[PDB]
């Protein structure tokens, strides 16, 4: 299974991924990408069952791709996860997506903003949020360390504290983790967490 | 159960001259609580909120294609909608998914903005009017909230003893449900004023 | 105006400039070229009677008929062009069914006459048809007795006593004249007016072969189509006056 | 003009490809039909352009139903469809109501075929006209024939095609409500051979069926010696 | 003038001037005769170049083992009709594991090319075409753009094609009883009648088509000409 | 197959020349009056009746939509019968949709929505039926017109067919705002006294009103009622 | 059939298309109505053909129309094929907000609408909505705007501009008297009935006279205002006194 | 659930229970079970409530129609032929056996099988329902070829009481219909009009 | 869910109980079961709430159209077509068993529509839970062409065993009187159960419950 975290601050999200991608009982990649840059100002996080990710993920990424060249400027990081939460709950049809996402996007008069979204569509924005069965043993310990003015060195210190307890408690080898910050002056990637 | 999968409890409870709703804020996935802002409760107009609780993205979804709906309507007519009408369009539109239900519940609370009459309903997941004269609970801990409702309402309250009343019937009904409660916002409507509140509550 | 016409207004079914529907004026003509007329008349207790035109001597006289039976209850008499004719009575038909497949009841004659006009309104409005240039109708209804309808290619229609093709007009005057001396302004013989009224404007006193009388009744309400001798009996009971 | 389409009315209040219609059907050659006492007979002049065409070649006799017979005058490629839309509107009888279908309703149902083109300017009114025989042990012997226009009627004896009066006049001299059709026979190849323009159009050939008692409901040919018989006896009629 | 556009407007004369027209296609087109024994049925046709280089269009399409045509006039019409014929011969093969007899697939042909003759905003085929089949029956000749279809003992249409119908009234009473040799010599006269007095029946320019009881359809080009093109005259 | 082009083209004037002749049909029907009253709506039209062969009790010209809303028309009877149905037919789908009589703006947004489509159609001429549309909701009365080019306007007393603009000088004449309906009937009847020509009964006449009550059209004793006065 | 086809989608001699031509003539004899964008909103000032006496006044617009929160619409043309075309602008209005929770961009609805109103020029066989609209409207990229389009599917953005009756000679005076980024709400009112006191020429000015309704931004709200019968009155006494004044 | 219809000479008898049961409480206990399709041709139902009331109205109609453009009094095989081509063409949701019977001009009393099929079979005497097993041996054993319409009113009263007797989901009154030239003469048997066999007492 | 019918001498009485139920729970206890139709037909519905509301929501519309239409006042079996056409139609998905009465002219008429769309033609009905109840006292009690008295008391009587009797059903009796001449639609008729007066009172005071945010909204 596949794990996923982000964390919200006062100006700048970070999130973070893990970079395996297995077969049933052994990995076939550990460079796996999961992290789609959707513009310049927004991440689309996207694990689940395989196929629907890529598929959804990439369907979702030429129409906000159109919608700048349409229009000439970008869509509002709330307008894409509404556009993104309104494909994936267009569910009671045949076709499921059955995806688990993290939209993290900078909006130029909002801020930073998180959205959460599990496979039935339900949107809920949150200050942090987590997905796998590791969001079950790391969520706590940012419902313990968290506050609203978290500047960005302990953001990171608290995202190592919980790849340590991924290291320490979870069964499954996850030991490396790629991790990007959304500014005002778009994406910043930084160096991979290794174990 | 599939309505109890992100748990969820809504009330309303008529006044004098005044209406009262309250939801709960906890988002839920089974076991795993996510985040404890989940709105529930939308303004549908001046003196009229609506709120839907169940699935916790039927309620989007429900409540995105209402907002379609109404605004055209208000749109077209050039008028605010009256609470009735809005009972109907919204029985519709579940019954359009009749055999692929929505799993939402949703319960009307507002003011005739010209009678200022105080009205007060709910709906089965595929769209039974129930029009009440006391209250209307919806969610996963109903029979707590028909228990606490059934003994504290009185007639003719005043909108302090309203909140009163509402609020330690929210307050006692989901702290005895497990995958509800984490906070609770209540609506206080009023015909010159609307009161937006949230309580202390249980955190477990 | 007094006569305009602009383009295709006289080919089609458009606005001249004065608004006549000059196809739907001239499908009236069409009345008129079956060369035949049938007269229709109600009491307390409704009558149609239309000649019977054998030309040719080869002719099963059988299957020669311009009285329909729509439904049990329903009858009716067509003028105009015979094709036209049987196209709508299959049609009145198939309506007086359908109603009584929808709502459980048999059909009234008004609500038959108007959705026959409702049909034939379309052809005067859409433009790649004709309108069907041909009906009269006769029933109990339950509360007002004896029922008489007549519907045109124009797609109007509710009558006393009424005249259909070529002599119409004299028909019409006729039976506007008679009506003023009958109490009531409502007629009493019924089978006999409508023969006195055919053979006044064609000026024939028919043989009991030429004419063809349908009638409904409070007796009975089924539409009953009569025998040679019992048309024979009242064209010679009207004979000794 | 006034004639260019079969959905305009004239002024007068004539529908004029209909009756220009009317004047294709007696462009072609004579069809006579009689009933009698316990059957139907049709006789075509059938025409042969060429002595390089086959016998049989442009049939005009068509079966429609196996108690139904079918003649026919006019544009054959129109007459051709007709006889297919006759036979499958009589299958889809059998098919639905269990019985062979009347001929009233037959008739009833083709020419309301007829009539459904005579009102669109999206399609031509068909050139031709036909009649319908048939006989059965409850339903006695019918025939009827259809106009171009679509109306139908029940007839004692018939006659279509461009000698249309005068086969009609020879018909109305003979007692057929009385006669075997053995005798039918030799009396319609009379009226055949009285009607046949020698001049104008040469090579021609006779072609007679007989629906009826005789064949016991069964829409057949006339065999060969009886064919050639009534051939030897209307030919030493004409003289 | 005005009833000469359309194929669904009667002229006042009781025709449709527009279908007559269709005749003419026929009535210029590069001419070819049939005829048959009790045993073969021989099509001969004259090959079409554009002059020369453009080697000799095919007139005799191969349209089953049992059944050839010939065209005279639009040739994707023709092409039209030979699917059209290929598609139903396949479909009583696949359905009733016999081949189609000729007779009901010329009736067939005659009710499709009829429907265009009577619907508004079409044309009626501007082809005619002889067709060459064996079945249980026998050899059958058939001619066709009206929709009538016509049963023929030989027949010749196309371009000035009243000579080789001369021809074929004159020398019919032969044919039943000559052999497939003698019959398709029969036919070579019958459009060589028809020809340009310079021009003589070469391996270029004249195609044989030939079915008989125990041979299947073959049409004969270039090389397998050259017996039949030998004792002619 | 039914056509698909336009019969309603631009003339270098810019008209649509088809309407402008469907107004003139309008204009050739029989008579029609509407006033707004201060409680209610009157409607009353002539009955183009001669021939006394006709039984009246078999057309209405005032038709009913719901229980307070109803038109009444000048020019081709046939196609008033068909928005007449069309009318009835909307009103029941809002009827499914909101459970609430129409409102009578609502009703003619999408009458005058279906006299549009037919002039711009393919193969479909426009109607020849101008309408009067008259409701009572919110209190308060209404009166519409709609034309057969689609366009409606709201009217306080108004009047169409034949002579409408002699009509629409005694209408301007006669009207005061406080009139009461039974005063409105009167001034009605006094409006199409002018081009009635032939002796007025009840049998030629046709009057509905519109008030809290409900619509409902006047039976020919209270015709007579009114009639005798005039 | 060939006969009656009038074929409104084919060219011209010259490469016109005569319906949408003759559209544009029945639109010059349309209403006069402009639109003036100023730095705190944007007005629209039309005259209302609504003039006989008999009249209702039922609605609180006769050409504006709402078609979202955030902005209005005129109509000038035929009366139906402007209800029709708003219609459509209300249903792509809130196709979008459905589609993306947030108001549309004031561009994509016009040009939505103009691709409408260019597939029924080329093919269908119809004959083409014979109608202009001004489009005003507010959103948080740029802002009050203003569009004007017609019935070829064209739109520009404009600062002042005029349609209907006497179009040239009331934009040749918003030429004239335009203070390019410093106009109010009160002196752009001042200048749009000082333009509508000289297009006016049938009825010289009375009292009901206009329709005139302005869009602002109060608190975070848009909020599109119909100005009432006593505004309009005092603004027009204001006019007539500005009028006074002009000479000495 | 016993209906049954027997042909004599000249015109036919049906019979039928009353009681029409829902599991084991009896929902109606007056169930009139002779539904008339024309004049003299009448259906039974047995089955499905549901279905054998549905197509009986499209077989009405499409009867009805045609009796109308034929100008005659429809045939029973046709009636028979529209519930075989019916019944047939929606045989897997549909649960019904009908037995239609009647008489016609031209072939006199008939009565024709359709079983849960749509095919079509005429029979001297058709049994039908749940409780027709009960009298399968009655029938055969009693049936004498040729029974006057009294012999035959007696028969179909003794046939029907003896398998409202055995059967439970079957009881109530007899309504019979004897349907001839003359018309239709429908009556009813209630109480101790209906056929008394003692029970086997000691 | 206890509703009742009776054909008496003028016309036909309806009956119904008022209690709601969802899972094992009152819902509701004043829900009406006897819906307007037509002005003389009323359609009591039985089974699912929802299927049923729409339903007679849809075939009154339907019944408004046609009334308009002919003029006249609708009969009962143009109602009992629309309701076994559709309910056919759906095949029995709709969960509403009906009660389709109303008089018409040629006189009262009782009709119960199963939802698979069988009809029977009844004297009286009982549908619902407490069907069974009911149906012993009509089995007990009634008589043909009875007073309109004496037909109100045996419907009362019928729901009141029908409420004692079953869990399903409760705390009021709707009546319906239909008639030629009269159209009483008695709401309620008879209340037989009452609710207890309440020993203590619990009035919270203001200050009582914690309060964490507030916000005044004005409005006009």
């Not at chain 4, 059938?46 to 068509?62: H, I, T, W």
């Not at chain 4, 009627?153 to 020879?170: D, H, L, P």
């Not at chain 7, 979202?68 to 602008?89: K, Y």
């Not at chain 7, 009050?144 to 520009?156: C, E, I, R, T």
Request: hydrophobic share 40%.
């Amino acid at each position: 299974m596949e794990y996923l975290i982000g964390i919200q601050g006062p100006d700048y999200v970070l999130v973070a991924s893990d970079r395996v991608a297995a077969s049933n009982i052994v990995q076939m990649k550990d460079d796996h990408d999961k992290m789609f840059k959707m513009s310049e100002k927004i991440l689309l996080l996207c694990v689940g069952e395989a196929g629907d990710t890529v598929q959804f993920a990439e369907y979702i990424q030429k129409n906000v791709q159109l919608y700048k060249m349409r229009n000439g400027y970008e869509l509002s990081p709330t307008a894409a996860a509404n556009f993104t939460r309104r494909n994936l709950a267009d569910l009671r049809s045949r076709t499921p997506y059955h995806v688990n996402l993290l939209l993290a996007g900078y909006d130029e008069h909002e801020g930073p903003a998180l959205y959460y979204m599990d496979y039935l569509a339900a949107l809920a924005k949150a200050p942090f949020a987590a997905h796998g069965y590791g969001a079950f043993l790391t969520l706590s310990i940012l419902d313990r360390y968290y506050t609203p003015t978290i500047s960005r060195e302990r953001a990171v210190e608290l995202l190592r504290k919980c790849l340590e307890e991924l290291q320490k408690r979870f069964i499954l080898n996850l030991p490396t983790f790629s991790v990007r910050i959304i500014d005002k002056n778009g994406i910043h990637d930084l160096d991979n967490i290794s174990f | 159960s599939i309505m109890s999968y992100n748990g969820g409890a809504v009330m309303a409870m008529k006044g004098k001259n005044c209406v009262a709703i309250a939801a709960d804020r906890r988002f839920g996935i089974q076991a795993q609580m996510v985040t404890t802002d989940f709105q529930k409760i939308f303004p549908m107009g001046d003196r009229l909120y609506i709120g839907l609780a169940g699935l916790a993205t039927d309620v989007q979804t429900v409540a995105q294609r209402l907002k379609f709906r109404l605004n055209l309507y208000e749109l077209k007519e050039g008028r605010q909608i009256k609470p009735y009408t809005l009972m109907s369009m919204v029985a519709n539109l579940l019954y359009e998914k009749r055999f692929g239900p929505y799993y939402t519940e949703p319960v009307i609370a507002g003011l005739d903005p010209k009678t200022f009459k105080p009205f007060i309903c709910s709906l089965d997941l595929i769209g039974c009017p129930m029009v009440t004269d006391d209250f209307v609970v919806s969610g996963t801990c109903a029979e707590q909230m028909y228990g606490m409702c059934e003994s504290l309402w009185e007639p003719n309250m005043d909108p302090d003893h309203l909140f009163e009343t509402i609020s330690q019937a929210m307050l006692n009904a989901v702290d005895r449900d497990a995958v509800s409660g984490m906070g609770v916002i209540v609506h206080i409507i009023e015909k010159d004023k609307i009161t937006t509140r949230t309580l202390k509550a249980r955190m477990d | 105006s007094r006569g305009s016409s602009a383009g295709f207004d006289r080919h089609i079914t458009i606005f001249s400039p004065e608004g006549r529907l000059y196809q739907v004026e001239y499908a009236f003509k069409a009345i008129n070229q079956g060369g035949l007329t049938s007269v229709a008349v109600r009491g307390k207790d409704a009558v149609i009677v239309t000649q019977k035109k054998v030309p040719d001597k080869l002719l099963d006289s059988s299957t020669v008929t311009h009285l329909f039976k729509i439904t049990e209850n329903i009858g009716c008499v067509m003028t105009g062009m015979t094709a036209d004719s049987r196209s709508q009575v299959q049609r009145a038909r198939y309506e007086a069914a359908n109603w009584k497949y929808k709502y459980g009841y048999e059909i009234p004659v008004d609500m038959l006459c108007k959705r026959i006009a409702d049909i034939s309104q379309v052809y005067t409005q859409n433009a790649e048809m004709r309108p069907l240039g041909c009906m009269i109708l006769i029933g109990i209804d339950e509360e007002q007795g004896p029922q008489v309808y007549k519907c045109d290619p124009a797609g109007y229609y509710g009558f006393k006593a009424t005249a259909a093709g070529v002599k119409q007009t004299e028909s019409t005057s006729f039976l506007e004249k008679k009506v003023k001396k009958k109490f009531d302004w409502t007629f009493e013989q019924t089978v006999e007016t409508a023969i006195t009224c055919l053979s006044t404007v064609l000026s024939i006193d028919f043989k009991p072969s030429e004419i063809e009388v349908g009638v409904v009744t409070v007796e009975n309400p089924k539409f009953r189509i009569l025998t040679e001798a019992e048309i024979d009996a009242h064209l010679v009971a009207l004979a000794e006056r | 003009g006034y004639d260019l389409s079969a959905s305009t009315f004239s002024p007068d209040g004539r529908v004029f490809q209909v009756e220009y219609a009317m004047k294709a059907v007696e462009n072609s050659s004579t069809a006579i039909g009689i009933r009698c006492k316990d059957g139907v007979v049709f006789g075509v002049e059938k025409l042969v352009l060429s002595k390089l065409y086959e016998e049989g070649s442009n049939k005009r006799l068509f079966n429609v139903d196996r108690h139904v017979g079918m003649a026919v005058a006019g544009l054959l490629a129109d007459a051709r469809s007709l006889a297919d839309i006759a036979r499958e509107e009589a299958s889809n009888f059998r098919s639905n109501f269990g019985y062979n279908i009347p001929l009233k309703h037959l008739a009833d149902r083709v020419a309301m075929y007829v009539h459904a083109y005579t009102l669109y300017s999206a399609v031509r009114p068909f050139g031709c006209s036909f009649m319908l025989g048939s006989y059965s042990v409850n339903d006695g012997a019918q025939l009827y024939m259809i106009d171009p226009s679509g109306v139908s009627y029940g007839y004692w004896g018939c006659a279509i095609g461009k000698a249309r009066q005068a086969a009609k006049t020879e018909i109305e001299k003979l007692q057929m409500k009385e006669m075997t059709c053995r005798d039918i026979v030799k009396e319609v190849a009379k009226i055949i051979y009285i009607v046949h323009d020698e001049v104008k159009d040469k090579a021609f050939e006779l072609e007679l069926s007989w629906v009826g008692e005789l064949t016991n409901g069964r829409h057949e040919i006339v065999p060969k010696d009886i064919r050639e018989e009534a051939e030897k006896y209307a030919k030493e009629s004409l003289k | 003038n005005q009833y000469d556009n359309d194929v669904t407007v009667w002229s006042p004369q009781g025709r449709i001037h527009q279908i007559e027209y269709a005749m003419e296609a026929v009535k210029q087109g590069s001419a070819t005769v049939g005829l048959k024994s009790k045993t073969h049925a021989v099509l001969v046709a004259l090959k079409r170049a554009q002059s020369e280089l453009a080697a000799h269009q095919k007139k005799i399409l191969h349209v089953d083992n049992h059944i050839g045509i010939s065209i005279a006039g639009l040739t994707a019409d023709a092409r039209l009709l030979c699917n059209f014929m290929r598609q139903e011969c396949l479909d009583s093969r696949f359905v009733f594991d016999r081949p189609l007899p000729v007779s009901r697939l010329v009736s067939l042909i005659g009710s499709k090319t009829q429907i265009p003759t009577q619907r508004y905003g079409r044309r009626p085929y501007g082809v005619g075409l002889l067709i060459a089949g064996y079945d249980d029956m026998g050899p059958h000749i058939f001619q066709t753009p009206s929709a009538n279809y016509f049963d023929c003992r030989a027949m010749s249409i196309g371009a000035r094609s009243q000579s080789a119908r001369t021809y074929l009234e004159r020398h019919m009473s032969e044919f039943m009883e000559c052999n497939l040799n003698e019959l398709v010599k029969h036919g070579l006269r019958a459009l060589r009648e028809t020809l340009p007095a310079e021009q003589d029946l070469t391996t270029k320019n004249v195609s044989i088509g030939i079915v008989g009881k125990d041979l299947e359809f073959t049409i004969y080009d270039d090389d397998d000409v050259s017996p039949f093109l030998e004792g002619l005259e | 197959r039914g056509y698909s082009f336009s019969l309603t083209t631009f003339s270098p004037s810019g008209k649509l020349v088809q309407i402008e002749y469907a107004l003139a049909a309008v204009a050739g029907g029989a008579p029609s009056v509407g006033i707004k009253a201060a409680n209610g709506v009157v409607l009353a039209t002539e009955k183009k009746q001669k021939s006394i062969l006709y039984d009246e009790r078999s057309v209405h010209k005032v038709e009913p939509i719901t229980k307070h809303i109803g038109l009444v028309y000048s020019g081709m009877g046939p196609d008033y019968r068909v928005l007449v149905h069309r009318a009835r037919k909307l009103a029941q789908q809002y009827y499914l949709v909101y459970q609430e009589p129409i409102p009578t703006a609502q009703l003619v947004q999408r009458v005058a929505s279906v006299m549009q489509e037919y002039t711009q159609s393919g193969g479909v001429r426009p109607f020849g039926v101008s309408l009067l549309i008259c409701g009572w909701n919110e209190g308060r009365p209404y009166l519409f017109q709609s034309d057969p080019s689609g366009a409606y306007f709201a009217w306080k007393a108004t009047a169409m067919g034949k002579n409408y603009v002699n009509g629409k000088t005694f209408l301007e004449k006669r009207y005061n705002e406080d009139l009461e309906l039974e005063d409105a009937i009167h001034t009605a009847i006094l409006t199409l006294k002018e081009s009635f020509e032939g002796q007025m009964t009840e049998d030629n006449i046709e009057v509905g009103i519109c008030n809290e009550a409900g619509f409902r059209r006047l039976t020919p004793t209270e015709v007579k009622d009114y009639l005798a006065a005039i | 059939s060939r006969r009656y086809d009038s074929r409104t989608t084919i060219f011209s001699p010259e490469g016109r298309l005569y319906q949408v031509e003759y559209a544009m003539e029945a639109i010059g004899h349309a209403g006069t109505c402009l639109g003036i964008l100023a730095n705190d909103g944007v007005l629209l000032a039309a005259e209302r053909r609504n003039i006989h006496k008999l009249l209702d006044e039922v609605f609180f617009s006769e050409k504006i129309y709402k078609l979202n929160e955030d902005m209005a619409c005129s109509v000038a043309g035929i009366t139906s094929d402007a209800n029709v075309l708003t219609n459509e602008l209300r249903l792509i209005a809130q196709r979008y907000l459905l589609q993306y929770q947030e108001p549309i961009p004031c561009e994509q609805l016009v040009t939505a609408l103009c691709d409408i109103k260019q597939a029924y020029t080329q093919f269908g066989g119809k004959r083409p909505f014979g109608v202009s609209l001004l489009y005003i409207g507010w959103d948080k990229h740029y802002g009050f705007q203003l569009y004007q389009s017609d019935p070829s599917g064209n739109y520009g953005g404009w600062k002042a501009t005029c349609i209907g009756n006497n179009s040239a000679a009331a934009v040749s005076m918003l030429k004239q008297d335009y203070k390019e980024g410093e106009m109010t709400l009160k002196s752009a009112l001042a200048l749009a009935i000082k333009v509508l006191n000289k297009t006016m020429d049938v009825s010289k000015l009375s009292a009901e006279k206009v329709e005139i309704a302005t869009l602002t931004r109060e608190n975070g709200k848009t909020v599109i205002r119909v100005l009432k019968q006593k505004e309009v009155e005092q603004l027009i006494k204001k006019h007539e006194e500005e009028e006074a004044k002009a000479e000495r | 659930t016993t209906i049954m219809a027997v042909q004599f000479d000249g015109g036919v008898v049906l019979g039928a229970d009353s009681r029409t049961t829902t599991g084991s409480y009896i929902a109606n206990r007056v169930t009139d079970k002779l539904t008339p399709i024309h004049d003299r041709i009448f259906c039974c139902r047995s089955g499905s409530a549901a279905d054998t009331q549905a197509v009986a109205d499209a077989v009405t109609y499409q009867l009805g129609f045609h009796s109308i453009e034929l100008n005659e009094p429809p045939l029973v095989h046709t009636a028979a032929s529209l519930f075989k081509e019916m019944c047939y063409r929606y045989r897997e949701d549909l649960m019904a056996g009908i037995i239609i019977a009647g008489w016609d001009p031209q072939e006199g009393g008939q009565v024709y099988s359709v079983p849960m099929g749509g095919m079509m079979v005429r029979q001297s005497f058709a049994i039908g329902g749940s409780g027709s097993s009960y009298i399968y041996g009655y029938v055969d054993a009693t049936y004498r070829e040729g029974m006057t319409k009294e012999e035959c009113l007696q028969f179909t009263a003794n046939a029907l009481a003896l398998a409202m007797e055995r059967d439970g989901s079957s009881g109530g009154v007899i309504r019979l219909a004897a349907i001839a030239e003359s018309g239709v003469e429908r009556q009813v048997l209630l109480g101790d009009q209906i056929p008394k066999f003692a029970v086997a007492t000691l | 869910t206890t509703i009742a019918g009776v054909v008496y001498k003028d016309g036909i009485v309806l009956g119904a109980d008022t209690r709601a139920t969802e899972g094992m729970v009152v819902a509701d206890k004043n829900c009406s079961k006897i819906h307007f139709i037509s002005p003389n037909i009323y359609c009591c519905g039985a089974g699912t709430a929802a299927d049923t509301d729409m339903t007679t929501q849809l075939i009154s519309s339907n019944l408004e159209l046609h009334s308009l239409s002919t003029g006249r006042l609708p009969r009962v079996v143009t109602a009992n077509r629309m309701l076994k056409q559709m309910l056919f139609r759906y095949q029995g998905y709709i969960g509403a068993a009906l009660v389709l009465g109303g008089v018409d002219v040629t006189g009262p008429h009782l009709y119960s529509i199963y939802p698979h769309g069988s009809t029977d033609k009844l004297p009286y009905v009982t549908m619902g839970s407490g069907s069974l109840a009911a149906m012993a006292v009509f089995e007990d009690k009634f008589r043909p062409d009875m007073e309109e008295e004496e037909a109100k008391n045996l419907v009362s009587e019928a729901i009141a065993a029908g409420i004692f009797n079953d869990l399903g059903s409760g705390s009021n009796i709707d009546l319906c009187v239909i008639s030629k001449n009269k159209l009483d639609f008695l709401r309620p008729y008879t209340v037989p159960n009452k609710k207890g007066t309440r020993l203590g009172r619990y009035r919270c005071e203001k200050g009582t419950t914690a309060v964490l945010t507030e916000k005044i909204t004005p409005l006009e």
